[PDB]
Design a protein around this nucleic acid. Sequence first.
RNA 1: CGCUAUUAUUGGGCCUAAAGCGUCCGUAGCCGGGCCCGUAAGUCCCUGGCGAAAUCCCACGGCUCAACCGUGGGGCUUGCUGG
RNA 2: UCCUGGCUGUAAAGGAUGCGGGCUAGGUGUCGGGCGAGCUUCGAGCUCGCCCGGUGCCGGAGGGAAGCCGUUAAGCCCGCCGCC
Lengths: 89, 55, 196, 223, 129
Amino acid sequence: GDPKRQRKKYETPSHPWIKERLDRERVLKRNYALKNKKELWRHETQLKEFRRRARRLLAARGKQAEIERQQLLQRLYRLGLLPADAVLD
Amino acid sequence: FEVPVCTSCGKEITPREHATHFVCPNCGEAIIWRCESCRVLSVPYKCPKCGWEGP
Amino acid sequence: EYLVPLDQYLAAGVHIGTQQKTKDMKKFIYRVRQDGLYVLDVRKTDERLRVAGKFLAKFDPESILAVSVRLYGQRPVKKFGEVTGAKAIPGRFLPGTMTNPQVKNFIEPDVLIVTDPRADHQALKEAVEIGIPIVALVDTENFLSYVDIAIPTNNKGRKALALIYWILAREVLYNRKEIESREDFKIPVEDFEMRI
Amino acid sequence: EIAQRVLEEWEPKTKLGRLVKEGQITDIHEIFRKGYQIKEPEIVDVLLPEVNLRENQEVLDIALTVRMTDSGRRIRFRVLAAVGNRDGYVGLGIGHGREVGIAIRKAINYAKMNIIEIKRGCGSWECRCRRPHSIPFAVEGKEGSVRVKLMPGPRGLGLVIGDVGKKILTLAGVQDVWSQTLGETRTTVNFAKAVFNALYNTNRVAIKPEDIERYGIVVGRAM
Amino acid sequence: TLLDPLANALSHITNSERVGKKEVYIKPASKLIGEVLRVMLENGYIGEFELIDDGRAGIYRVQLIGKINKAGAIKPRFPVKARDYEKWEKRFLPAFEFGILIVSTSQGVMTHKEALEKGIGGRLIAYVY
RNA sequence: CGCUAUUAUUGGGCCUAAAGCGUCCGUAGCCGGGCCCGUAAGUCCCUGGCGAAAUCCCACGGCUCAACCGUGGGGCUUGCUGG
RNA sequence: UCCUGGCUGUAAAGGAUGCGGGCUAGGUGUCGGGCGAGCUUCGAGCUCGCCCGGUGCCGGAGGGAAGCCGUUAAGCCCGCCGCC
Ligand SMILES: [Zn+2]
Ligand SMILES: [Zn+2]
Ligand SMILES: [Zn+2]
């Protein structure tokens, strides 16, 4: 077969020239003094990964699912995005 | 609020359906509701209290 | 027992149908003649006339509408209106009286009475669009579609139509308590018929 | 202020208009599930004042149509417009016109008169909240060759559908939805009507008392 | 020719629902049809079904209450494990707890909720919503 | 690769747009009415022995964080086999 | 072009619509069989109605890009073959 190369940790948009998206992202870039769109995109990607994990784990059965729920909540707490009495929704 | 229900069948009345409603002619105590499909297809109806059993 | 003797019913011919029929009217047919003509049952006519009397009396007179495109039913509608207060439209029913408020005689009633649901198919449609109950005089060849109360009777003959509308006006009055009881309705049935 | 401002200069022509001017009918939900005809846009201006703000009056399409009289050919405008409050009430209309202004105004008045009331909730396998941010179950609509299927989605998933549907659902008050389509979407009229009919058919599914609690179902305005 | 009577029963129920009937007659009866109707009654989708003895193979008389949108048989009767019900829920039903998959198990005919409670799988034979 | 439900099990079409053999008989195969008894091959549950490591997901720890590396928990190997 | 006995295997060989089964309003004609009522010039005759099976026209719900189809589906379900 083939070995795996290292892959990007950000995702680009599906259409490049949509006005609403351009305006939103222009505001964000200007206000948080970012150098490029790569940074915004990689933070967006972080958030999307958290969301996908929650969607997958929500209404699932087994021991590992419970363990991973608690891990996700602890990590968000430790990063400063949720409080302690936070639920998965 | 509440949503009404046909008397022949048991299905909710939709917003812009050509439905009708009236008072039972024999009794005078109930409200008969009729939906568009039951009207165009001539589905019979029966009052709950008396049972007058009309079209 | 009866609102008017069986002799009078059969003299008028309320019980005579046509050579056609329908499945919706199977409830109301009694017997087919040997010549192929269908005969109605007068007891169900009597019952439905009583019921319709009550129903109409439970309304307001100035919002009631009667119609008859057919020629042998214009004067009966006219007199039913004169007596009850109900509005009448004998001739044609210009399209738009119920759906277009830019016409001159535009009105929106709360109940509609139809003489024949096939000849009067325009007003039926408009009433369906505005959302009110429909009383109808139905014969064998008729369908019960978009009809909420149906009276079985011959809807062709002058004598029959006159008798039916006379009975119905008298019942409306009795049920509104404007006549202490029947026998106090001194209007002749001749006055409802169409002259020659 | 503007309530009476509009009420003063409106002379009714229908019984519903008269009741809405007097005050027998005071809420918007009282006109719907009865077979009333709605011939005046002032009824809706008065009961739903949110449908006069420019933010709630999307113009969806302008088309240029032609007729032959050569003879010389004659040019006309067709306009398709949507209106609605963002909490359960949307309508859609088409307008003929010789000028674009005429076409637009006619289309918006027909949209106000073609007003419906929808349901909302949460029925996705991935959120299971009890809040009305989506539709409660899956629905199907059609017009012409276009077939639309709308499916419930989870919070933060914003309107995975074409743009016409995006606008219509925004005006109806829906935030999250998945879509499947079939047919010719480039007919904007028929695509729009199909989405509209899908939203209408939320009221044709039969349910039970427990489904309301389970999905957080809401008929019209929330709270 | 006649190949599956359960499918016919359920299609007849759907069409009579669509046009607003009250009572429906199912001419070749079976014990699977009996059990499916039993599940449907327990879950409130019909009313008061009974069995009638012709000399051939009985008839089933069913009363309707305007609660069914769609009912159908599942062909082929796919085998399903206790951990693989959500795929089929998504494939056949419109929302997460809305309708019933009817499952045949070695312990009998039941819904996929009961089956999950017991931790068993089986075969798919019907959906109702 | 996706766009493409322009290969369609999920999930397409065949009067007039591409498309029902000129009509019939029948071989293999595929699909097959209702009840009772048995069997347990398919099917379902539970347990033992296998499916190398790397590569995939999660948390913690060590390089200024990170990429990377380590310690653990799962998954993957389309499945095989004893009860 | 007809007759006797053989070959060829083709057509707008068209309902331009493969075959079987179940369900989803009917009206009005006509052919064959049966039953029931009346008439009868007593006729294997005439008239009306109902059941089964064939063959047509119209049509509500519904379907379809529309023309149009609509219990003799071009609707919903269960199967098998052929073709794009
Ligand atoms: Zn109904
Ligand atoms: Zn009553
Ligand atoms: Zn949610």
